[PDB]
Paper text:
To gain molecular insight into the way the PIP box and the APIM motif of ZRANB3 interact with PCNA, we crystallized and determined the co-structures of PCNA with the ZRANB3 PIP and APIM peptides. Both the PCNA:ZRANB3(PIP) and PCNA:ZRANB3(APIM) complexes show the typical homo-trimeric PCNA structure, consisting of three PCNA molecules in the asymmetric unit forming a trimeric ring. Three peptide molecules are visible in the structures, each of which interacts with a different monomer in the PCNA trimer. ZRANB3 has a canonical PIP box that binds to the PCNA ring in a manner similar to other canonical PIP boxes (such as those found in p66 of Polδ and FEN1). Specifically, the conserved glutamine (Gln519) in the PIP box peptide interacts with PCNA by forming a hydrogen bond with the main-chain carbonyl of Ala252, and by an additional contact with Ala208 via a well-structured water molecule. Furthermore, Lys518 and His520 form main chain hydrogen bonds with Ile255 and Pro253 of PCNA, respectively. On the other hand, residues Ile522-Phe526 form a 310 helix that orients the conserved hydrophobic residues (also known as the ‘hydrophobic plug’; Ile522, Phe525 and Phe526 in the ZRANB3 PIP box) for docking into the hydrophobic patch on the PCNA surface. In the structure presented here, the PIP box peptide is not long enough to form extensive contacts with the IDCL. Analyses of the synthetic peptides containing the PIP box or APIM motif sequences revealed comparable affinities of the two peptides for PCNA (KD values of 4.8 and 9.24 μM for the PIP box and the APIM motif, respectively).
Cellular responses to replication-associated DNA damage are centred around Proliferating Cell Nuclear Antigen (PCNA), a DNA clamp that acts as a processivity factor for eukaryotic DNA polymerases. Structurally, ZRANB3 belongs to the Sucrose Non-Fermenting 2 (SNF2) family of ATPases and contains several identifiable domains and motifs, which provide specificity for a number of defined substrates. These include the amino-terminal SNF2 ATPase core, two PCNA binding motifs (the PIP box and the APIM motif), a specific type of zinc-finger (Npl4 Zinc-Finger, NZF) and the HNH nuclease domain (named after the three most conserved residues). We have previously identified ZRANB3 as a structure-specific endonuclease that plays a role in the replication stress response. We further defined PCNA as a key regulator of ZRANB3 function, which recruits ZRANB3 to the sites of stalled DNA replication and stimulates its endonuclease activity.
Author numbering:
A (entry chain E), B (entry chain A), C (entry chain C): 1 to 255
Write the structure that this text describes.
């Protein structure tokens, strides 16, 4: 058996909402160390990496390593049948070809069991050589989402320019152009309100806004987001999933 | 004249919202005892019965029995022009054949009058035999609505059964299957939260979820809903309209 | 240079939202005395006049008079990138063919600069003649908006009838008819509920509800609206923009 019980089930709801518009189907790699998923979008512009560590679950059992092929649209539809306060259990019997999802309402005597048909996927995994970035910007996730939404009404590409003291986002199109400058904050009450820049050298890169707007579907997972940038390599947009791991999106820059 | 004054005019707004998507037109039978309406949907799968007793109105006068043919879409449009706190009066002047609606805003100096054209309807209407049911479930209306909504995203038919400690709902379709068990418990704050099951013998029946999702448009009328079930007869879904009567929906089962 | 700083930037957001569906493109006339705009809709049934006086701005400089041709759809898209609490500055360098818009977030270290491309417009500007009105009604803007929305579900034309005691709105269509009467309030000065009538003689006029329902996009600018009416002349629907001026819509009657 594989069995993972998650008291904060809404985490899984949010994870699916953060994946299903970008990726139609993916392999969920289950092992004793937790749940991993890596997948490229169909136009091969971006890659998403999910980690949910075994220790983040309330109980966790994995007797054999699995690669479950999942239609993410189907799994999203099922997770929409869970209430936000539900305890959610994922379960797969060693030799079965389905994934079971159990939703327990904690302040109600309601229990739902869903059985999702799996699919056969040949996914070749790709190694992300780890690296050091020229600029890492940490900022409120809502602010990043608003910026990418607003600029997408101006143009389809955003130039992200980062220096010591601020980050600038600019776009250009038929109606004209726009630039948004966020300065580094000094004094904030809540760390989560900060803008923080760690800069080794300045960078200026161009990215497709449509893809950024897919990424910001993760916004409910975290109050903050980090952008990691170097010349000639993909941007990494990272959302921590507290106690569990993360969702990282990689976006190839424009030439 | 017919004249009926309802201080809680939102009741009528809710009733029309509960009817108009299922039934396009119906006869409103007005007598001294109140308002009665019975109608089949156009595919002859379901029947709806409304009762609003004279004593539930603030004032009520009916000099002669009427059968007013009403386009429910039209009446709904008119009742949408009433505020939720309005006092609503229905009137048919001594020998008119329109229905007049008057909306008085209780905390504002605004009065609206609407005159709705009636239509000629030839309805044969049906005898409801009293019967006893094998299982009668009372449960929170919002929970029933959520269940029917969720399961309709899984399949188009629901199998409803009763265990001695709960009621079960299941559905099956392209993406897989779901099963929901609502169990009884004494740990409720409010009576309206209670699941009550009166069972003479167990039942298992299948019904079209699309029709159930029309019926749950009545959810605003009551915190609770009653399901009455026997083998080989229609399901009855009943919403009490407190102090006034009820809206009952009957649904023919599938084999 | 032209430069106008507005601490209550949401005013400009609200103005564009009030204009852009009715008028696609218009000339913004800039002088030392402030900002003026006048335009007809494409079907030549209505005219809009905007005034924003220089003294309503927090700072205002205009070195030379301008006639900036603006695609309102484009300017709306840009102003939707401003937060509701933003300070908004409009700026145009004497010889440039663009309008700059700067949005400062007051409780955040975020500054946005947008440059909007202008267009060449040949607009003939119309003389508004000498006209004394038979009736002038002041009433809550939200109530006027609700009335025009509700009646547009009954018919496509409203008859507006004004007398000493009240103003009446009526419509007639396929399903029947509706009439709404608003009485003059004795105690007043609560803008959100006061109805006040100044009447030389009673009037009754007919107008196209579809245009009124464009005008009420201005509702957020003011708690109150003023309707000015005489026989055989356009209705004036006026929204005060406190500290600044007004937005006035003129609508030709149906004869
Ligand atoms: Na439970
Ligand atoms: Na009143
Ligand atoms: Na029981
Ligand atoms: Na600031």
């Amino acid at each position: 058996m594989f069995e993972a019980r998650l008291v904060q089930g809404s985490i899984l709801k949010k994870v699916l909402e953060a994946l299903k518009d970008l990726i139609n189907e993916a392999c969920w790699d289950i092992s004793s160390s937790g749940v991993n998923l890596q997948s490229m979008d169909s136009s091969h512009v971006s890659l998403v990496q999910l980690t949910l560590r075994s220790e983040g679950f309330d109980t966790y059992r994995c007797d054999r390593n699995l690669a479950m092929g999942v239609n993410l649209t189907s799994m999203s539809k099922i997770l929409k049948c869970a209430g936000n306060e539900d305890i959610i259990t994922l379960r797969a019997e060693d030799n079965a070809d389905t994934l079971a999802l159990v939703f327990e309402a904690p302040n109600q005597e309601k229990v739902s069991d869903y059985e999702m048909k799996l699919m056969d996927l040949d996914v070749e995994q790709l190694g992300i050589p780890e690296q050091e970035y020229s600029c890492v910007v940490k900022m409120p996730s809502g602010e990043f989402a608003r910026i990418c939404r607003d600029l997408s009404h101006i143009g389809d590409a955003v130039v992200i320019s980062c220096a010591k003291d601020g980050v600038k986002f600019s776009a250009s199109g038929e109606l004209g152009n726009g630039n948004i400058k966020l300065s580094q904050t000094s004094n904030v009450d809540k760390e989560e309100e900060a803008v923080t820049i760690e800069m080794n050298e300045p960078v200026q890169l161009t990215f497709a806004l449509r893809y950024l707007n897919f990424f910001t579907k993760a916004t409910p997972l975290s109050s903050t987001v980090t952008l990691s940038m170097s010349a000639d390599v993909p941007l990494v947009v990272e959302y921590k999933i507290a106690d569990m791991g993360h969702l990282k999106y990689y976006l190839a820059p424009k030439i």
